[PDB]
Amino acid sequence: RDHWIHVLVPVGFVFGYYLDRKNDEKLAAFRNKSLLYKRELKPQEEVTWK
C-alpha cells in the first residue's frame, strides 16, 4: 500500500474501540440483574446489552 501510514491511527482507534467492547463482556456481572433495569427476556434475545 502506497499510503500504509494513514491507517496507523484509525485502525488503532478501531482495535481500541474493539477492546473497549471486549472489556464490557468482562463487566457483565449485573447484566439484567440490577433492581432498576431487570426485566424478562424478550423472544429472540439472549442478553440485554452487549
Partner: protein, 459 residues
C-alpha cells in the same frame, strides 16, 4: 478510554515512520481525527458518570478537559512547526514525541478512576514538560525555570503520595467511585489538618496558588510555544481537577481549612492582576494573568458550592482557550521582532489588521465579555462568592476592573499608537498563524451557544 489511548500511542509510529516533509502534516491530520473522536465522551448522564472500566471513567468534569486536551495537540503542532523548521529531523521527531507522550499522560490523568494512578499520571506529566522547556526553550533561564517547575511540583506532591497511600490503607481503596460512597467525615484535629494540607498543596502548586506561583512566570516564559500552550491551557487545570476530586474526602475540615488559602487567592487575584499593569514582558503579562484567573478557580473550589464548581470548570475551559490564544499571539509577534518586550513593537494594527482583530477578540474574552464562557465562569464564581460572603464582591469587582485594564493596555501597547520606525521585518500574517487564532477562538465563541457541556458534573 482505550479508544483514545491507543490512537495517541499510534501517533508515535505515525511520527517516527513518516517522510521528512510529512511529519507535521500527518501528525496534525491524525491528531485532528483523535480530537474529532473526542466528542464521544459527551455520553454523560444526569445521575451517573460514564464509567468505562475498573481503571477509566469520565464524568462531565473530565470530559471538557479531555476534549480540550485532545484539541490542543494539533494547535501545538501548528504553533511549533515554524520555529523548529531549521531543527534536526530526529530532534523534531523527539519534540513531537514529547507532545504526544504528554497528551498520553494527560488523557489518563483526567480519566483515572483510582487516585494513585491519577498521581502517577499527574506526576508523569512533569517529564515531557520538563524536557520540552529545558531542551527547546530559547533563553538561558530555561534550566533554572525547569528546576523551579520540577521542585515546586514534587515538593508539593510527595506529601500527596503519602496522603493517598494513607487513604488507601484506611479506606481500603482509592477508587473515586467507591470513595463517593465510603467517605467518612474528617474531624477537626492536627492529624487531619496535615492530612488536608498533604491532599491540597500539590494542587495549590499546580493551579498556582498565590505565593506558590513563582515557578509559573519562569516556566511559562522560558518555554517554547507548545510548552506554554500546554502549561497554561491544560497543566494548570490538573490542580483544579485534582481539587475537585480530592475535596470529597476532606469534609468537614475544609470548611475552616480553606480560610487562609481563600485570602491568598482573593488578595492574590488583586495583586497578580495589578502586576499585569506594569509588566514589560508580554509573555510574563499573560503568565500573571493566568495566575489571576486561576485564583478564582481556587476560591470556587474552596467554597464548594454548586454554582462555584460550575463556574470553576467553565472558567478553566475558557481560560485554557483564551490563554493559549494569547500565548500564540505573543509568539506571532516574537517570531517577527525576536523580543518579548511589549513596548518594542507598537501600532501593529497599522500593519496586521486581521491579526489585530484576533488580538481584540482574545483581549475581549480575556476581560470576560458576555456572553462568552469566560464571563459565564467569572460570573458564576462571583455569584457563589457573594453567597459565601457579601463583602467579597469588592475584591471581585476591583479585580474585574483591573482584568479589563491589563487586557486593553496589552491591546493598546501592542496594536495601537504609532508604529516603531526602526522595525521593518513585520511580515504579513501567515495562513498558519491566522488558522491557529481561529482554531483557538471559534470553538471558544461556539461554546457560548451551548455552554452546558462545559459546566461540569453538577449542571
Amino acid at each position: 478510554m482505550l479508544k483514545y489511548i491507543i490512537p495517541t500511542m499510534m501517533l508515535m509510529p505515525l511520527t517516527w515512520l513518516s517522510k521528512n516533509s510529512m511529519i507535521w502534516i500527518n501528525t496534525t491530520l491524525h491528531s485532528l481525527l483523535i480530537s474529532l473522536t473526542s466528542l464521544l465522551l459527551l455520553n454523560q448522564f444526569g445521575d451517573n458518570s460514564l464509567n468505562f472500566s475498573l481503571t477509566f471513567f469520565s464524568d462531565s468534569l473530565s470530559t471538557p478537559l479531555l476534549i480540550l486536551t485532545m484539541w490542543l495537540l494539533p494547535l501545538m503542532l501548528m504553533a511549533s512547526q515554524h520555529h523548529l523548521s531549521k531543527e534536526n529531523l530526529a530532534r523534531k521527531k523527539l519534540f513531537i514525541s514529547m507532545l504526544i507522550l504528554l497528551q498520553l499522560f494527560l488523557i489518563m490523568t483526567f480519566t483515572a478512576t483510582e487516585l494513585i494512578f491519577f498521581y502517577i499520571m499527574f506526576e508523569a506529566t512533569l517529564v515531557p514538560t520538563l524536557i520540552i522547556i529545558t531542551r527547546w526553550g530559547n533563553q538561558t533561564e530555561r534550566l533554572n525555570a525547569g528546576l523551579y517547575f520540577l521542585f515546586y511540583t514534587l515538593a508539593g506532591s510527595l506529601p500527596l503520595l503519602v496522603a493517598l497511600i494513607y487513604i488507601q490503607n484506611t479506606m481500603g481503596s482509592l477508587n473515586f467511585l467507591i470513595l463517593q460512597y465510603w467517605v467518612q467525615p474528617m474531624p477537626n484535629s492536627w492529624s487531619n489538618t496535615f492530612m488536608w494540607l498533604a491532599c491540597m498543596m500539590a494542587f495549590m502548586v499546580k493551579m498556582p496558588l498565590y505565593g506558590l506561583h513563582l515557578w509559573l512566570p519562569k516556566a511559562h516564559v522560558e518555554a517554547p510555544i507548545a510548552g506554554s500552550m500546554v502549561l497554561a491551557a491544560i497543566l494548570l487545570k490538573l490542580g483544579g481537577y485534582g481539587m475537585m476530586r480530592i475535596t470529597l474526602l476532606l469534609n468537614p475540615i475544609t470548611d475552616f481549612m480553606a480560610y487562609p488559602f481563600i485570602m491568598l487567592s482573593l488578595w492574590g487575584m488583586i495583586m497578580t492582576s495589578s502586576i499585569c499593569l506594569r509588566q514589560t514582558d508580554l509573555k510574563s503579562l499573560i503568565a500573571y494573568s493566568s495566575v489571576s484567573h486561576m485564583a478564582l478557580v481556587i476560591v470556587a473550589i474552596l467554597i464548594q458550592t454548586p454554582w462555584s464548581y460550575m463556574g470553576a470548570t467553565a472558567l478553566m475551559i475558557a481560560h485554557g482557550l483564551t490563554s493559549s490564544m494569547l500565548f500564540c499571539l505573543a509568539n506571532s509577534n516574537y517570531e517577527r521582532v525576536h523580543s518579548r518586550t511589549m513596548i518594542l513593537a507598537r501600532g501593529l494594527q497599522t500593519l496586521l489588521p486581521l491579526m489585530a482583530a484576533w488580538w481584540l477578540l482574545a483581549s475581549l474574552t480575556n476581560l470576560a465579555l458576555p456572553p462568552s464562557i469566560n464571563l459565564i465562569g467569572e460570573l458564576f464564581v462571583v455569584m457563589s462568592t457573594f453567597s459565601w460572603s457579601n463583602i467579597t464582591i469588592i475584591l471581585m469587582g476591583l479585580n474585574m476592573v483591573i482584568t479589563a485594564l491589563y487586557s486593553l493596555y496589552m491591546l493598546i501597547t501592542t496594536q495601537r499608537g504609532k508604529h516603531t520606525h526602526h522595525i521593518n521585518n513585520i511580515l504579513p500574517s501567515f495562513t498558519r498563524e491566522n488558522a491557529l487564532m481561529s482554531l483557538h477562538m471559534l470553538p471558544l465563541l461556539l461554546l457560548s451557544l451551548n455552554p452546558k457541556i462545559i459546566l461540569g458534573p453538577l449542571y
